[PDB]
Design a protein around this ligand. Sequence first.
Ligand code: 356
Length: 315
Amino acid sequence: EVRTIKVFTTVDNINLHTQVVDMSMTYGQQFGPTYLDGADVTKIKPHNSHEGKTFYVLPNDDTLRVEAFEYYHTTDPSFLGRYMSALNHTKKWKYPQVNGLTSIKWADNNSYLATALLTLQQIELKFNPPALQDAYYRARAGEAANFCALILAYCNKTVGELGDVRETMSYLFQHANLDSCKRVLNVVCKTCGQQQTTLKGVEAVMYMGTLSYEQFKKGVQIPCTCGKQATKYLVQQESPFVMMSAPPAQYELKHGTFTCASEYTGNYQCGHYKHITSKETLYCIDGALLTKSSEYKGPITDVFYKENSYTTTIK
Ligand SMILES: CC#CCn1c(N2CCC[C@@H](N)C2)nc2c1c(=O)n(Cc1nc(C)c3ccccc3n1)c(=O)n2C
C-alpha cells in the first residue's frame, strides 16, 4: 500500500519546512543525510512514531543554503553532520553547576572543553553566529549539550579526539566580535634599531610564550635575530581581556592576580586539563570535581586576565 506521515526538516531548528515522507523509503532516499536530535536516521525508515518532528538535513537547496549560512556563519559542506555526530554524545553528558559555573562531567576526553567552557562563563566575549549566541545562553543556564557539539563542529574535533585549549579558544575567538581589540608591541635588542608592530583583533588578545602578563609588560627575552637577546615589551593594550599561553611549565598562581588558568598534566599523548579560577580563594574545577587552596603551583598553559585599557610607561 501507500503510507506517508508529515514531518519537518530544518537546518537551524528554527525555520521548519513541511515535508510529506513516504513511509517505505529511508530518509536517506528522501532528504539525504538526515538526523533526529543527533541520531543518524538516513537509513531508518519513517516510524509513524515520528509525525510532527524535526529532522536536521544537509543544506541541499538554496533556501537551506542561506538559513544555514546565517545561523552558523559557515558553508563548510560537512559542518552539519559533524554537529549532529557530536550532539549525539553531548546530549548524554552531564553539565553540573560547580561554584556557580556550568562545567562538564568528564567523558570522552572533554577535559579541554570543560576548561574552555568554564573560561567563557568568565570573560567578556560576544559571539557572532546566532547559533553560538543562542547555544551559549542556554549553556550559561546550565544546558550546554548544543554549545558543546557546536564547539566540536567549529573545531573539527570529533567526540573522543584529543583537543588543545589554546586552539579551541582560537576558533571561538574567530566567531566573536573583537574588532575594537588592539595590541601594540615593541621589540628592543640592546644594539638594534628596535622594531615595533601593532596587532588587531584576536592577534591582540592571544600571546604564546609566557604565562605572566606583568612579565610581558616589563619585557620578554625572545629568540631574536640581532647581536644579543632582545626584549619584547607591551606598549599598548585595548581589549576586555588578554590570554597568555605557553607550553606546560610548573608555575604558581596567586590569588587576586588572574581571572583563570589551564593546567595540563600528562604529555602530548596522555594528559588532562584542569581549570583554576580566582574567586574568594583559588578553586580548581576538574569536571564535576571541586577543590580549594590558597596558592597553586602546577603545570599551567593558559592564564587569562581582565583588561580594558593599558599604556606602558617604559620608554
Ligand atoms: C550578527 C553578525 C555578524 C557579522 N558576521 C557575518 N555576517 C555574514 C552574513 C550574515 C550576517 N550575520 C553577517 N559572518 C561572520 C560574522 C562575524 O562577526 N564573525 C565573527 C568574527 N570573525 C572574524 C574573522 C573576526 C576577526 C577579527 C575580529 C572579530 C572577528 N569576528 C564570523 O565569524 N562570521 C563568519
